[PDB]
Design a protein around this nucleic acid. Sequence first.
RNA 1: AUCGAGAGGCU
Lengths: 180, 160, 773, 65, 114, 196, 43, 264, 133, 86
Amino acid sequence: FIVEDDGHKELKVRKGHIAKLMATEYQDVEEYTWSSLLNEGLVEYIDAEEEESILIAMQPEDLEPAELDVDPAKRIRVSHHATTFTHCEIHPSMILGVAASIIPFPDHNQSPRNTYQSAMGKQAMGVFLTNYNVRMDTMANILYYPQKPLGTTRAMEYLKFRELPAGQNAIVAIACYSGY
Amino acid sequence: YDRKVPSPTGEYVKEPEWVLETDGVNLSEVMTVPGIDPTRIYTNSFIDIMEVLGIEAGRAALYKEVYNVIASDGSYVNYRHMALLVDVMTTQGGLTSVTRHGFNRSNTGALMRCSFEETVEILFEAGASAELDDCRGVSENVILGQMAPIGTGAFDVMID
Amino acid sequence: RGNLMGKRVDFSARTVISGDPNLELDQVGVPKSIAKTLTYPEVVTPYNIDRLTQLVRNGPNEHPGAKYVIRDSGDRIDLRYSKRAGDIQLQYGWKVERHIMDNDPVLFNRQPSLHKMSMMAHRVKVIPYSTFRLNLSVTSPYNADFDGDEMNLHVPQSEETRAELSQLCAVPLQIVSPQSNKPCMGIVQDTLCGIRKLTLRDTFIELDQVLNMLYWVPDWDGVIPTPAIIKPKPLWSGKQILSVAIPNGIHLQRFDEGTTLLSPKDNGMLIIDGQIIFGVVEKKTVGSSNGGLIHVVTREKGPQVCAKLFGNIQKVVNFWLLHNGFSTGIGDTIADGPTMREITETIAEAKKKVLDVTKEAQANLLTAKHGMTLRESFEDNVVRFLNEARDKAGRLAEVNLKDLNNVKQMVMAGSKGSFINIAQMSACVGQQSVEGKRIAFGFVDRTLPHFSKDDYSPESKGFVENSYLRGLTPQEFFFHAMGGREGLIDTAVKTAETGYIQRRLVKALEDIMVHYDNTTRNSLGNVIQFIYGEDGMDAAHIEKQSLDTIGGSDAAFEKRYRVDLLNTDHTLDPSLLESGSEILGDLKLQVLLDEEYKQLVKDRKFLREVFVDGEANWPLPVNIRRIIQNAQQTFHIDHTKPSDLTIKDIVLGVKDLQENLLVLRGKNEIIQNAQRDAVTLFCCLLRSRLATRRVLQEYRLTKQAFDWVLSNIEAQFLRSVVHPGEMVGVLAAQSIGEPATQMTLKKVTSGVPRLKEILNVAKNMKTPSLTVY
Amino acid sequence: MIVPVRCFSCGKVVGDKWESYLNLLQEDELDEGTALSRLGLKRYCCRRMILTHVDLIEKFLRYNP
Amino acid sequence: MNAPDRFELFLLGEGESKLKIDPDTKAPNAVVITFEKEDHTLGNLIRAELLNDRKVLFAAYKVEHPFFARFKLRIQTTEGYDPKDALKNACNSIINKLGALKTNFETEWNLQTL
Amino acid sequence: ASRHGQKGTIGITYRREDMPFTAEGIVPDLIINPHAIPSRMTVAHLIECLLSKVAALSGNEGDASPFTDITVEGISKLLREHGYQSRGFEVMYNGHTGKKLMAQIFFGPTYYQRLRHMVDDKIHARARGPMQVLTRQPVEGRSRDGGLRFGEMERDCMIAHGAASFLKERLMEASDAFRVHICGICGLMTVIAKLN
Amino acid sequence: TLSHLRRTNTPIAKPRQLHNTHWGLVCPAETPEGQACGLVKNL
Amino acid sequence: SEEGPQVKIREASKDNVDFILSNVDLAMANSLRRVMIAEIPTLAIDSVEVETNTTVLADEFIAHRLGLIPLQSMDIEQLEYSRDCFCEDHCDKCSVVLTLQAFGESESTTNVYSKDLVIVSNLMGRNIGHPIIQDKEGNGVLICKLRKGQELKLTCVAKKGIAKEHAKWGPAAAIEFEYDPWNKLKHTDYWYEQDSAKEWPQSKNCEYEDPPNEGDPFDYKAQADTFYMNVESVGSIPVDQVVVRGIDTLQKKVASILLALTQM
Amino acid sequence: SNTLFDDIFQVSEVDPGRYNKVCRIEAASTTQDQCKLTLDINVELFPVAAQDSLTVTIASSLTRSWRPPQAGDRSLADDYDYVMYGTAYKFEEVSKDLIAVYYSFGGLLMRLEGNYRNLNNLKQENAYLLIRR
Amino acid sequence: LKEKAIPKDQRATTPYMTKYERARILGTRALQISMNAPVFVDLEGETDPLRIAMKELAEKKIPLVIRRYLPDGSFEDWSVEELIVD
RNA sequence: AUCGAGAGGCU
Ligand SMILES: [Mg+2]
Ligand SMILES: [Zn+2]
Ligand SMILES: [Zn+2]
Ligand SMILES: [Zn+2]
């Protein structure tokens, strides 16, 4: 994202542009595309060396002005304690990889477990393609009745996971039983 | 260091004592300092201790270092095993390293040595010096496939 | 290294492993296909020719059968494709490649083979499905786990090989690990939590369940034990039932904290003659610990008794557990409200304290304590504060965890898990670390771009306040990933470095064999240790017993050991001996008492001049307390009547005993000197426990009971001698290399870095430190 | 790749309920929960079979031969 | 591949006697009965019925290994009480209970509408 | 495996009768050991079980996106709204007996993955199979009916037991045994041998 | 398939660790195990 | 009426029956719930000989899917196990032959519902082999889908079996099972955080059994004898016959014990 | 084969501890200010109130297998409300003419002090405890 | 070398049969019994040559002699009879 | 026969 003064400091994109985007997306009329944003000067490409000179926000809510009785269940986030903002990341979940974006609630797990699972999800059987009957590969495995997961990341929508799953919502019981 | 010492009454009690810890080792000189005890001083550079306090003191320093590295993880291995290792390294003149530079240069035949590191170079030096291999070594008979002189073949069996 | 030292062999097999509680220990569940494929050559004899004919008739394709036949002519016979597979005329002396049958010995192993206890003999049990099967209590020596692990099996082809498997590599023999002088095997996670729940004072089993339980133990007499409760409803306790698996004549004593003989919280453990008296059973009692049940039953009754005991425990415990249930859920990770409030209170307190320390630092008021900079001292202060806060919040959690909380129970029994696990999962997960330091400054003067420059605040360098349950924030998640990668890399390196170290040790000490004279020699005969282990004992048959001589006041020393025939107050009250009246004066006896006492004092100041620390618990080749309790239960002492032992008997029998606890048998001065130097410590322990007062005021022995004690100690010593031919070198190499494999991660080079520094002589060591007294 | 016949857990048939579902959702503009509860899919052992199923076969048809 | 044919849970084969009976050692008036090709369904019911006959001292079953369909039933009775007789009494009481239950349920369902 | 590095092999296949069951007759497709939980701190496994229950009942999607305001307390509230115990626990009876398990059990939907590692393609056996031409040793790999390597590392662990003749057998009759003739003057196998 | 299309090799214990600069560009967790861990990454 | 077990039905329907068992030992109710799943024999497909398969689905996929099709099994006990009859492979009084043939005629998608199964063998006048249809529209389960141009033609053979050998031969729809909503037996200890009561929900069966007094001590010698069940059925056999046939199978199982006992 | 001790105790201190069905009871002999006892007792079977007065008795009998009561033909030696079976594991000679006996009823322990039962209690596997109302 | 035996009286080695020589002894006797060799005990209804050799050892009727070599080249001969098993 | 890559396993 891109932030600049207004008024006070604020990022550039607004709900008007979001509505234009969802309008171009729903059409499935001047379309609104990513290239429009990049050319309109609302979103920028920051490489490694460049971000050494910027101070990024984590949530757009960080640009909200604030001057208690909070649901104690929610995790603790440090108060921003910074004003000289330049950008806001699109969404933190985007830092993850492809295979790790599959993991549900990875913000809750010892990271070695996430690493193990991101290595194994490349070994899980599933529908690797839809033309699997037509393609003649050396070795291929396909689940009889794949199921989309009940617990879904957002990024799955873009990874086409709910359309080409590789597991099943098995009813699992955590119990001692016969020691087997 | 809150060591324990005999009370004049006889039972052990903890009597705390100050101890210095350095980041350098020149023992041959720090040993001869006044105001210290030249009998208990310890240096984790057991090599300098071999050089100064004789080899057999280096034995105990080496074992103490191994014991500390084991007990770091709450572990324990019986004394005899570390003692075997330490004394094998020690039983020669001085410290024989556990590497090609050390025991592999000993006179323990050729094939027993050939099967660790620098195989062909060992074979060449042996074919030069006309090494007469004892062939009582384990790896020698294992290579030969014959029954190696081990606990089950460490003897012969015959008739009445 | 690929075709002579180790190569590929026939009669081998490999597949997945899976645990089956209903298999005995020494058993291996072999799939039926592998058994159909592997062959053992058996020679035809009049005792077997019938079984062999039938086997031939079952064919190589259906088990139990045979595959090949070898006549005297040396030309083979294939049973799959032959005119005469059915009509055979078995001639004597011929060989038959029978299938692998039940109760066969097979060499079963796991790679990596670090241990002698990783390649063990196993009795075959053929099962239908496609996996190798083995007992749970045999994971520890193999370091096995059923998440896809694989294991290997080899089959002998001659009877002497089968003998070497049955009598040396048998699984029960490898129970007491030589290294660590402890049993490597023990009760496992599920069975462990189950046995804890079962042995509670609050556990009551009713007649219906009780009868099935009693039946489950295979070698049961078939005599019900009288229940605890009778009148309102016949009820048994988990201890009462479980004591059936415990063989008669076993006595076990253990005192934890607050283990009054009343046992208010049922801590510790006391068990008498195959009956458990009191104590909640858990890891320390039944795990692979020294002084545990397995050590006792192995030393006392033997290998096979303890082997069967394993299954006899597991079966009852698995039955009860299966009919009682267990789960985890998240509710066993939720701390209630006020605990969360006080935990975030502790966190905010630590935050404000670190902020105040930093404000102090910003005014150049820090004390540059000698030997370290301002920044190093500051970092140490902050890391100390953050670990303080994490551990304090974790104890704040563990306090509030109720008893029914299944994580608290799994931890209490010692099944799996620990404190830090609870602290992180519930309270707060603490401070991540990279190369010892906190989160470094990857970017210019900041950790992450969402931070201002030069921000040393806790979260700015990775203090993960939130608990795993509460949810990790993005930056904290990233720092945690940074730490996890360091961990995985340290694993992937230490593994290879440890494999190299072990290979070098094995190749170094491969020829170190205790010869017959006990001179620990090499191939070249160069002596290494004139007495293996400096005492001539095998590493097993050695237990952690105390020396009552060392420590304790001289006053209490006298009060318990001084027996003076020439004083009305320092002499054996005739309530302690028959001849006690006619024993006063008698200089011919006080001379022997003063000899004994001078020897005991000489030995007290001897050991006290060796063990400057004064620690009394040490490994010794024969346990005494077990023999004393075996006496107190075998002969049923009344502790009221006096003994029938003249002091001459006691002291002359002890002084003659040391003459027969032989280690070496030379008839010359040097060998007998080495002998006196080999039994010295044991004889010290002996004279401590066979004190003429102790045998009569603490023990209350009879004559025959004492002679039984002497014969038993002599026998147990002579058994505990290290057996010649032991390649103790390879054993020691493995015994040091294996614990290095598990050397996981204050200011010194330690762990595998230090080990590499040590073995390879590292003149340029990283941390050369001098300690000055 | 198609609707399983019955729930693997219990065994109540579900195959005869697919086309109803797709209709109960679109023709009648219902939500998922009311639809599942309508077809006598009370327990979730069955409910997951219909809610989480993916009908790939409609993509498998497009391939011509 | 190595799996047993599924019918091997209830199809006895090659002289697989339904019931084997053996005297228990170190236990007078007691017997162990190997039930072949059976499961907990029958054994637990037999034991629960045996426990209600007063003249039966001990009655318990064990399923040795879940791979196999079989179990063992051990019974100790009073003096002058052959255990097979207690077994017969138990099974007969079971069958009479079952017939009574079937009759009651048929009556109630025929009374029941919808 | 689940989606949290919970690897696991099948040790047993139970039938629905022998399986425990809730009052609703629902039977666990899978039974996993509780002990494997706390040593890995895979809390998300249990949270996913809970959330998948809530979704399967409510008929919504499980929003497991990271960095969300999904409170376990709110998941519990939703689950209690639908008549189940708010932490995923369920009263369960043993199948063999029907006696209620005195300890209640954690139970619910959970996404699971079947992995490319399968046994019937890993089982291996050999008893005097093919021989490699170069070293007259058993060839490598089960795909060619090969033999297992009795590596030197294993030979060490074997010698620690002191089995001399077992080692001789594993190294002579189990692979590339050979009888060769040698001359008593030149101790080399250059001897012309006409055995027949 | 995707994780194989977004692979990154490195031809070279300093590098393998996660560097701060990998934020937003490379996955924190997704990487092989054992040998060559942390060298081969995923965008 | 009859002395012993007592039964009241709370509710009954074509596919499920919720009822109450009184004055019965538990182990009997357990063995009944087990038999009602496992050993009550019904009929479903055990062979499929495929003729032509142009579908996008593998052949053995379709064979599996046919296995699970529910076939009417009311008059089954007048049929015999194929392992028991003396035919070559399957007679007409040990098995029922079915056939299926559909073609991708329509440009629009051509489904294959279960109702398109055609019988061949002689029924000999017993209500057997009708693929059950519980759908509103009369179309059975969905077996496969067909594009214009694809055809499918195969021959099923259904034999008699039990859920043990394979779970397609079960009326095994979920069997609701409960007793003692109040835990008066002290059979289970309720996991709780603050209070054991307000955290767990009360069962509906709480309406029928009186709550315990706070002052009431434990009735130790109380044994559970009152159970609450709800049997569901797929449709292979109506619910009324499911429980009755299970009971009869159980009595016959004990009869086999009696007969082998007398044979001894 | 008869009784070995008899007394009456007034309840001094009852404690639930962490156990849910068992309580640690402690009392002292009535009208005798020198003999007391500790005991573990199931409260679910036999409730125990504070400051009660409970008859306490110990018998030797009234080996071979157990058997449940076939009928009333088996003559009980117990009109009491509570019965247990124990084992002697310690006889603490506390003071001069003062002894303490330690029993364990399958885990539920018992401690007894005093020196007027001396001629009776023994290191005997067999030990029965009876408690009337 | 030349007749470097050891007189039976002047013997210092362990009279106890070490488990290693015991295993080798049972192996060689089970080899004898493997082929058709004589048996010197009333085989009380057992067939496994290993259990037969173990019983043969208990009754000490196994006529074999250990030759315990000593490192210099000396060696002590020990018949089974004078060797103890424990 | 060579070489390369990917994967399995070790709280
Ligand atoms: Mg593994
Ligand atoms: Zn279902
Ligand atoms: Zn020559
Ligand atoms: Zn027929």
